[PDB]
Design a protein around this nucleic acid. Structure first.
Lengths: 100, 395
DNA sequence: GACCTTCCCCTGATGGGAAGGTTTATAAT
DNA sequence: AAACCTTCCCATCAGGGGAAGGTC
């Protein structure tokens, strides 16, 4: 299925998603460093299988698995700059999000 | 020259062209052969072929009994071939020729008695055909012989027919050359259609064979392209759709000035618009992994491709550590709970088991098990027992 | 208490459709 | 490229039944 730019990403903390808008794009002017997520994206992945040791965790803490992987525009490792421009190209027929 | 395309282009020069009498008289030879077959049928090509094959089947049935009796009376009994043919020619129906050969009283004459038992029943198979096909065992053979002659006439005439007009196949194939398919492939796929045209042409319609051969060869080349060009084969009608879309977008260039709006093709074309984007997304062709890369260097596209099926060792080590941690943790609970957890889940076991599956061999069925799990997970939910495992869940 | 009508699950029954095949005649080498 | 036709495979619709609900 089509990928998503939603800010809702699995396996991430709040300190990381603090720097993204409702659509999941880094705020203009906010300075970042390597590892930070600039554009949150999630590619749909399926047929997840777990070693019974991990299904045990799924049963114990109730932390359910997600049906989507993680591809994100994260700052290249070693460089730390400041966002000066953000452009959004939306295809035809694809509904325009808030940031767009 | 060396290439085989030259060995073909200059080989077909030995066969001269035919027009216009040649066409008609070689077609008459073909029709004369098939007309020899037609009288032989007396005693749409689709049913005609079954009739032909049925005659052939009858002759095979007769020849089977022939060779069986022959092996029995010559190989297994040592009678001379002449003494077999002379006595067997003429009757081929009754057992009258066997008793005479016995009465011959030569040394082999005794071994006939033993194969008489084995030949009598083989002869009944052979004779029954007469009551089926209303013919004698000899007329079958004669009819088949004449019809084979007809086939031979048709064969020689048709091979000459295709050899004569071979050049037209190249004349047609040179138009299509560059469609991801090699040249000889095109000319051969056209020769196939040329043969199919030869077999389905009436020389009496008065038209020139050029037109019919042209139609058939053109179809046999275009459809063959659709079949064998793309590495990922595409349904035959989809290639037609792609060609139509490309033709429309080509024609509208000078109309729109630069290129047409996508929604227009859905208008110009018969198809609604939502499929056009799928038809354009489908057309992408594979890129050779040997494609040179930036800087025009030796690096190629077949290099920058990682392997993503693999799991990084940083995660396999964590898998093993979780294995060990849960192994130490499950031992902290009771033996009942340990077995229940290693059963409902596939821990240290062949496979996972369901509720009644676990309850089957635990002496107390479903609900009991449901009460143990929810309790054990509760007993492990508590911190001071879940910290080492809690370190494994990060979100 | 039965009767008339009602509310949901398996056999397959099928119109729908994608993939496939055979023809096409002015002449055309 | 079009033109009408056959085999195979869908993922869905008329039909049946096993009971189920509600009422003069």
């Amino acid at each position: 299925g089509p990928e998503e730019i939603t800010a809702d990403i699995p396996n991430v903390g709040e300190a990381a998603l603090s720097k993204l808008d409702e659509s999941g794009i880094v705020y203009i002017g906010a300075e970042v460093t390597g590892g930070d997520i600039l554009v949150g994206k999630v590619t749909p992945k399926g047929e997840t299988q777990l070693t019974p040791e991990e299904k045990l965790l799924r049963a114990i803490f109730g932390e359910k698995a997600s049906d989507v992987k993680d591809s994100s525009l994260r700052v290249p490792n070693g460089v730390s700059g400041t966002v000066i421009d953000v452009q959004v190209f939306t295809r035809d027929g694809v509904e325009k999000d808030k940031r767009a | 020259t060396t290439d085989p395309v030259r060995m073909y282009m200059r080989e077909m020069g030995t066969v001269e062209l035919l027009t216009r009498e040649g066409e008609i008289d070689i077609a008459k030879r073909i029709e004369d052969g098939i007309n020899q077959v037609q009288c032989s049928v007396a005693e749409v090509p689709k049913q005609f072929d079954y009739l032909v094959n049925s005659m052939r089947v009858m002759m095979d049935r007769v020849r089977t009994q022939e060779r069986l009796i022959m092996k029995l009376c010559v190989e297994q009994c040592k009678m001379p071939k002449k003494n077999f043919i002379t006595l067997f020619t003429g009757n081929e129906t009754s057992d009258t020729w066997f008793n005479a050969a016995i009465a011959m009283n030569k040394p082999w004459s005794e071994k006939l008695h033993d194969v008489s038992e084995e030949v009598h029943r083989a002869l009944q198979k052979l004779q029954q055909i007469e009551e089926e096909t209303g013919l004698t065992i000899e007329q079958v053979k004669d009819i088949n012989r004449r019809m084979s002659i007809g086939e031979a006439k048709a064969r020689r005439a048709k091979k000459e027919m295709v050899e004569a007009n071979l050049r037209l196949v190249i004349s047609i194939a040179k138009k299509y050359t560059n469609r991801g398919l090699q040249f000889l492939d095109l000319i051969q796929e056209g020769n196939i259609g040329l043969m199919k045209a030869v077999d389905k042409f009436e020389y009496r319609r008065g038209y020139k064979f050029s037109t019919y051969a042209t139609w058939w060869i053109r179809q046999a080349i275009t459809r063959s392209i659709a079949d064998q060009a793309r590495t990922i084969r595409i349904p035959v009608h989809m290639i037609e759709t792609i060609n139509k879309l490309n033709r429309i977008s080509r024609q509208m260039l000078q109309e729109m000035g630069r290129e047409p709006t996508p929604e227009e093709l859905a208008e110009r074309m018969l198809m609604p618009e939502d499929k056009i984007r799928k038809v354009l997304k489908i057309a992408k062709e594979p890129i050779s992994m040997e494609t040179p890369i930036g800087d025009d260097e030796d690096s190629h596209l077949g290099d920058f491709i990682e392997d993503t099926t693999l799991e990084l060792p940083l995660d396999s080590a964590t898998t093993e550590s979780l294995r060990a941690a849960t192994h130490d943790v499950l031992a902290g609970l009771t033996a009942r709970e340990a077995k229940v957890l290693r059963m409902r889940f596939g821990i240290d076991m062949n496979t996972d088991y369901t509720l009644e599956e676990v309850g089957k061999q635990f002496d107390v069925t479903r609900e009991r098990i449901r009460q143990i799990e929810a309790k054990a997970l509760r007993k492990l939910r508590h911190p001071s027992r879940s910290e080492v495992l809690r370190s494994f869940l990060d979100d």
